Design an enzyme around this catalytic site. Structure first.
Site, PDB file in Angstrom:
ATOM      1  N   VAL A  82       0.645  -1.032  -0.018  1.00 31.02           N
ATOM      2  CA  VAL A  82      -0.218  -0.004  -0.015  1.00 31.02           C
ATOM      3  C   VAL A  82       0.777   1.232   0.038  1.00 31.02           C
ATOM      4  O   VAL A  82       0.063   2.201  -0.124  1.00 31.02           O
ATOM      5  CB  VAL A  82      -1.215   0.217   1.302  1.00 31.02           C
ATOM      6  CG1 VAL A  82      -2.083  -1.070   1.140  1.00 31.02           C
ATOM      7  CG2 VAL A  82      -0.336   0.113   2.452  1.00 31.02           C
ATOM      8  N   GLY A  83       2.108   1.249   0.382  1.00 36.37           N
ATOM      9  CA  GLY A  83       2.768   2.388   0.336  1.00 36.37           C
ATOM     10  C   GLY A  83       4.231   2.146   0.386  1.00 36.37           C
ATOM     11  O   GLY A  83       4.806   0.955   0.724  1.00 36.37           O
ATOM     12  N   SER A  84       5.170   3.058   0.373  1.00 35.13           N
ATOM     13  CA  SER A  84       6.697   3.061   0.042  1.00 35.13           C
ATOM     14  C   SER A  84       7.095   4.185   0.271  1.00 35.13           C
ATOM     15  O   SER A  84       6.646   5.489   0.548  1.00 35.13           O
ATOM     16  CB  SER A  84       7.144   2.072  -0.883  1.00 35.13           C
ATOM     17  N   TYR A 140      11.972   5.360   4.166  1.00 29.14           N
ATOM     18  CA  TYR A 140      12.383   4.619   5.362  1.00 29.14           C
ATOM     19  C   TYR A 140      11.876   3.270   5.392  1.00 29.14           C
ATOM     20  O   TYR A 140      12.248   2.457   6.194  1.00 29.14           O
ATOM     21  CB  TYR A 140      11.911   5.737   6.380  1.00 29.14           C
ATOM     22  N   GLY A 141      11.143   2.736   4.670  1.00 31.13           N
ATOM     23  CA  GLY A 141      10.267   1.423   4.730  1.00 31.13           C
ATOM     24  C   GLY A 141       8.982   1.219   3.769  1.00 31.13           C
ATOM     25  O   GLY A 141       8.265   2.167   3.719  1.00 31.13           O
ATOM     26  N   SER A 142       8.846   0.147   3.432  1.00 29.41           N
ATOM     27  CA  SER A 142       7.645  -0.397   2.637  1.00 29.41           C
ATOM     28  C   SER A 142       6.618  -0.923   3.566  1.00 29.41           C
ATOM     29  O   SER A 142       6.979  -1.308   4.680  1.00 29.41           O
ATOM     30  CB  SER A 142       7.688  -1.223   1.740  1.00 29.41           C
ATOM     31  OG  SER A 142       9.126  -1.252   0.951  1.00 29.41           O
ATOM     32  N   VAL A 143       5.482  -0.458   3.214  1.00 29.28           N
ATOM     33  CA  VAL A 143       4.267  -0.908   4.230  1.00 29.28           C
ATOM     34  C   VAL A 143       3.133  -2.050   3.380  1.00 29.28           C
ATOM     35  O   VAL A 143       2.900  -1.697   1.982  1.00 29.28           O
ATOM     36  CB  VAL A 143       3.384   0.226   4.524  1.00 29.28           C
ATOM     37  CG1 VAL A 143       2.356  -0.090   5.550  1.00 29.28           C
ATOM     38  CG2 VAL A 143       4.384   1.346   5.435  1.00 29.28           C
ATOM     39  N   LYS A 193       5.091  -2.682   8.501  1.00 34.70           N
ATOM     40  CA  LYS A 193       6.259  -1.959   7.980  1.00 34.70           C
ATOM     41  C   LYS A 193       7.586  -2.740   8.075  1.00 34.70           C
ATOM     42  O   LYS A 193       7.875  -2.941   9.068  1.00 34.70           O
ATOM     43  CB  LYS A 193       6.372  -0.437   8.646  1.00 34.70           C
ATOM     44  CG  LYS A 193       7.334   0.308   7.921  1.00 34.70           C
ATOM     45  CD  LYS A 193       7.303   1.700   8.326  1.00 34.70           C
ATOM     46  CE  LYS A 193       7.547   2.005   9.653  1.00 34.70           C
ATOM     47  NZ  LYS A 193       8.109   3.362  10.209  1.00 34.70           N
ATOM     48  N   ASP A 235       2.885   8.986  13.382  1.00 29.82           N
ATOM     49  CA  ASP A 235       4.112   9.501  12.503  1.00 29.82           C
ATOM     50  C   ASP A 235       4.799  10.828  13.298  1.00 29.82           C
ATOM     51  O   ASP A 235       4.759  11.914  12.919  1.00 29.82           O
ATOM     52  CB  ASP A 235       3.590  10.134  11.102  1.00 29.82           C
ATOM     53  CG  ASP A 235       3.070   9.191  10.083  1.00 29.82           C
ATOM     54  OD1 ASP A 235       3.164   7.912  10.432  1.00 29.82           O
ATOM     55  OD2 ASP A 235       3.021   9.416   9.167  1.00 29.82           O
TER      56      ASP A 235
HETATM   57  C1  LIG Z   1      -1.152   4.564   2.241  1.00 28.77           C
HETATM   58  O1  LIG Z   1       0.016   3.527   2.645  1.00 28.77           O
HETATM   59  C2  LIG Z   1      -0.044   3.368   3.943  1.00 28.77           C
HETATM   60  C3  LIG Z   1      -0.909   2.945   4.505  1.00 28.77           C
HETATM   61  C4  LIG Z   1      -0.954   2.892   6.269  1.00 28.77           C
HETATM   62  C5  LIG Z   1       0.095   3.277   6.681  1.00 28.77           C
HETATM   63  N1  LIG Z   1       0.151   3.015   8.110  1.00 28.77           N
HETATM   64  C6  LIG Z   1       1.515   2.996   8.918  1.00 28.77           C
HETATM   65  C7  LIG Z   1       1.146   2.436  10.119  1.00 28.77           C
HETATM   66  C8  LIG Z   1       2.160   3.028  11.257  1.00 28.77           C
HETATM   67  O2  LIG Z   1       2.162   3.825  11.913  1.00 28.77           O
HETATM   68  N2  LIG Z   1       3.145   2.058  11.604  1.00 28.77           N
HETATM   69  C9  LIG Z   1       4.592   2.825  12.235  1.00 28.77           C
HETATM   70  O3  LIG Z   1       3.854   1.121  10.448  1.00 28.77           O
HETATM   71  C10 LIG Z   1       3.437   0.004  11.003  1.00 28.77           C
HETATM   72  C11 LIG Z   1      -0.377   3.123  10.420  1.00 28.77           C
HETATM   73  C12 LIG Z   1      -0.841   3.165   9.028  1.00 28.77           C
HETATM   74  O4  LIG Z   1      -2.121   2.753   8.648  1.00 28.77           O
HETATM   75  C13 LIG Z   1       1.288   3.724   6.084  1.00 28.77           C
HETATM   76  C14 LIG Z   1       1.238   3.889   4.600  1.00 28.77           C
HETATM   77 MG   LIG Z   2       2.542  10.987   7.655  1.00 25.18          MG
END
Ligand SMILES: COc1ccc(N2C[C@@H](C(=O)N(C)OC)CC2=O)cc1
Ligand SMILES: [Mg+2]
Ligand SMILES: [Cl-]
Ligand SMILES: [Cl-]
Ligand SMILES: [Cl-]
Ligand SMILES: [Cl-]
Ligand SMILES: [Cl-]
Length: 345
Positions: free
Chosen positions: A27-29, A30-33, A48, A163
């Protein structure tokens, strides 16, 4: 007893995670999620995978800082840690760190742009930010990066702070939301800052919920300072004395003096109690701003304030921040915190 792990390639990355986590999807990418379903708790979660967590001393110390902060935060209005794991079986083979939290849906950006907020909505949203900030500040933690994209909100208007400040020159340059919520003393490095910078950010957020518009959308640092000083007035000699940079003091005195504006004529039609609270948050001299604990008792929140349900945090030892260690020593400290993690009830 160590769980069983399984491997899979997500985009261009190998992910190795315990069997409890299923249906991983990037869903997203310090690290990928990745989003996933946690079969032990029944929650949808964010997983993450940190990118190069120990590549330099600065990187290794930042990895340790993020894990210490997330392990400490236990409050209804702050993101908390559901799990942390590594596939390594010993310190010698330790290389990867994975963090697990609840999966957040919409942020406050979605809300302010798309929804018609009543005054009751503003009361409840800002109350929850301040309740979380009272907790954070009670541990002598400064968030430093509060803005709408770092506030998660659900369908029932419930809010969590995310964050934590854990930002480069390029990131803060120009017409960018990454700077519009920053206190002027940190935006321009006027002085050593403290937790009062977060209250300035709350003021900017509250104004935007009331009007639907960014309060200080500067096109650069100097344009933004001019927007700020037009609303709150140019500084008097008392504040000028506190600006440690002689350079910055010199520039401030180059500007023609301006009085503070009438906030009832800026925030036309707002609740007079909301106007009063904004005047107490958006004060140029950080020493004189209202605190989070003081703001919870303001009459604007009379519907929600409960001084027996606004908790403070356990003490948080930050002595590591002034410590000088080698990469492998920060890595060992991080390993110890991974293996000592105890999940919430
Ligand atoms: C849109 O793409 C993302 C979607 C979700 C998220 N995160 C990061 C999550 C978090 O605070 N920790 C540190 O990560 C484990 C909480 C959350 O919903 C990040 C990107
Ligand atoms: Mg943010
Ligand atoms: Cl498992
Ligand atoms: Cl949470
Ligand atoms: Cl590993
Ligand atoms: Cl934002
Ligand atoms: Cl501690």
């Amino acid at each position: 007893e160590r769980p069983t792990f399984y491997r899979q390639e997500l985009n261009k990355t190998i992910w190795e995670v315990p069997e409890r986590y299923q249906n991983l999807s990037p869903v997203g990418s310090y690290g990928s999620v990745c989003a996933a379903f946690d079969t032990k708790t029944g929650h949808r979660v964010a997983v993450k995978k940190l990118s190069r967590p120990f590549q330099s001393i600065i990187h290794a110390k930042r990895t340790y800082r993020e894990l210490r902060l997330l392990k400490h935060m236990k409050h209804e209005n702050v993101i908390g840690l559901l799990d942390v794991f590594t596939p390594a079986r010993s310190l010698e083979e330790f290389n990867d760190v994975y963090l697990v939290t609840h999966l957040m849906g919409a942020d406050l950006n979605n809300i302010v742009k798309c929804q018609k907020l009543t005054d009751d909505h503003v009361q409840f949203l800002i109350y929850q930010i301040l309740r979380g900030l009272k907790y954070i500040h009670s541990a002598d933690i400064i968030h430093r990066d509060l803005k709408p994209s770092n506030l998660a909100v659900n369908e029932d208007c419930e809010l969590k702070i995310l964050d934590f400040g854990l930002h480069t020159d390029d990131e803060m340059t120009g017409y960018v939301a990454t700077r519009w919520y920053r206190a002027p003393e940190i935006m321009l490095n006027w002085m050593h800052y403290n937790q009062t910078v977060d209250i300035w950010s709350v003021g900017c957020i509250m104004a935007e919920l009331l009007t639907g518009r960014t309060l200080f959308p500067g096109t650069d640092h100097i344009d933004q300072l001019k927007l700020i000083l037009r609303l709150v007035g140019t500084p008097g000699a008392e504040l000028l004395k506190k600006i440690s940079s002689e350079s910055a003091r010199n520039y401030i005195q180059s500007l023609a003096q301006m009085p503070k504006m009438n906030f009832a004529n800026v925030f036309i039609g707002a609740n007079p109690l909301a106007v009063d609270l904004l005047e107490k948050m958006l004060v140029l001299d950080s020493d004189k701003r209202i605190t989070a604990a003081q703001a919870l008792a303001h009459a604007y929140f009379a519907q929600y304030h409960d001084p027996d349900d606004e908790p403070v945090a356990d003490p948080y030892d930050q002595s590591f921040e002034s410590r000088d260690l080698l990469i492998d020593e920060w890595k060992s400290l991080t390993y110890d915190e991974v293996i000592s993690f105890v999940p919430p009830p």
